[PDB]
């Protein structure tokens, strides 16, 4: 299905993030496309490294889509990341 906006914004799900990347890396790549309301780059609970994914939230659908198309397929630290909508409107 299509993108489902969250309560106060639009959230993208970022995957295949280098394990040594930190919020800095995410901020650096994503800020250009809009003001970032939140970044959750969760750490692996056993290692302390990034677990490989992040939720990145923008204030508008415009910003999130700009980032999406600009960053899906880009690289952080030599590792290609994928950028998708985090939530969708319906099943299957």
């Amino acid at each position: 299905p299509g993108p489902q906006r969250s309560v106060e914004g639009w959230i993208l799900f970022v995957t295949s993030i280098h394990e040594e990347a930190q919020e800095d890396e995410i901020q650096e790549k994503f800020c250009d496309y809009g003001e970032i309301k939140n970044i959750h780059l969760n750490l692996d609970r056993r290692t302390g490294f990034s677990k490989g994914y992040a939720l990145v939230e923008y204030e508008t659908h415009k910003q999130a889509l700009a980032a999406k198309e600009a960053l899906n397929g880009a690289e952080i630290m030599g590792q290609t990341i994928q950028v998708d909508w985090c939530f969708v409107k319906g099943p299957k």
């Binding site: 299905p1 489902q4 969250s6 959230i11 609970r45 677990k51 969708v88 099943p91 299957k92």
Partner: protein, 144 residues
Amino acid sequence: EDFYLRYYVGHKGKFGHEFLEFEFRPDGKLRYANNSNYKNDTMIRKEAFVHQSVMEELKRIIIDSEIMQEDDLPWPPPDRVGRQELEIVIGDEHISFTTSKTGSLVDVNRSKDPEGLRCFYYLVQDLKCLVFSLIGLHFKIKPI
């Protein structure tokens, strides 16, 4: 490829019951219920559909943990004080574990299967971080 994931943890603590349960269905539907804050009479119950990339990362985290190769037979059983349940289907493989609330570094180290119990502990914690982030940011609520 068939997929399903459900985790439940419940307990009777000095200050009363408490439970948290979430489920990801093959259609991307995430269902979440958490009544872990006993200082209030409400509960958190939410659902949302997540994008396939989320379901794929979930599978990735589960595969990498190697939990699908574990067995709960030698694990402590659930007791009158705590219980955890973890059910997963990935393609052909399925597992269903039921055990007590996870004890200390000490308890796990002296159990019959310290390696398997640690694997279970860290996977559950990683799944919780992902679920808490999803619910929390999407609904702009504490997931608690």
